[PDB]
Write a protein that binds this ligand. Structure first.
Ligand SMILES: O=Cc1c[nH]c2ccccc12
Ligand SMILES: [Fe+3]
Ligand SMILES: [Fe+3]
Lengths: 111, 118
């Protein structure tokens, strides 16, 4: 049985739960984390990937988490649940506006 | 102005499952994805299986996560053998294996996601 438990893995420094090398190779990588601890961050740093990224925002009940996604100088405000595609090349980040305990935003890099 | 999906989850039927499963990524989104991702919050699933044992022709990952390590536990049946997963954990289920899971323990904000890998 193939079980990975040494998780998340820091990668440059974001917490990964799926990496492209696991289990013989994956077509996605998946990072992210619990949002309630991030409601407090006042700033986020724009960045760009060479593959598409999907943001996946979820909370125990719909509507309990809220982020702003800054994409190429446009501010978007999303409420859980929500998925948003960030095209490769695009400058982006998000800030957490609101979150109950056990709200998550995951970033999924699509190979 | 990129693509946002908020009509979620998407209920799809999956073999052996009592009710439609809640999908957040499906294969046709955004021009086509190499994965599908379903699942959700476990705190009201404790003791209650979502499915009879089932088999897919694709690999499935279970991804189990909770606000703190150790707050969620599931039991995966994989071809008659029982495995306990403790958050955080990723388990690969090879295509053709008969399987399902039972939630053993979960706080509010514990999740299990099933990831079907093309
Ligand atoms: O992967 C299947 C799954 C995980 N959580 C739920 C919740 C409800 C139906 C199906 C499922
Ligand atoms: Fe990103
Ligand atoms: Fe399955």
């Amino acid at each position: 049985a193939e079980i990975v438990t040494a998780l998340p893995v820091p990668l440059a420094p974001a917490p990964f739960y799926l990496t492209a090398d696991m289990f013989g190779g994956l077509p996605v990588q998946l990072a992210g984390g619990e949002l309630s601890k991030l409601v407090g961050k006042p700033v986020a740093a724009p960045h760009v990937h060479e593959v598409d990224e999907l943001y996946f925002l979820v909370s125990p009940e719909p509507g309990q988490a809220r982020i702003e996604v800054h994409l190429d100088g446009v501010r978007h405000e999303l409420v859980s649940p929500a998925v948003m595609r960030i095209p490769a090349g695009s400058e982006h980040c998000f800030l957490t506006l609101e979150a109950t305990v056990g709200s998550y935003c995951f970033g999924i890099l699509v190979g």
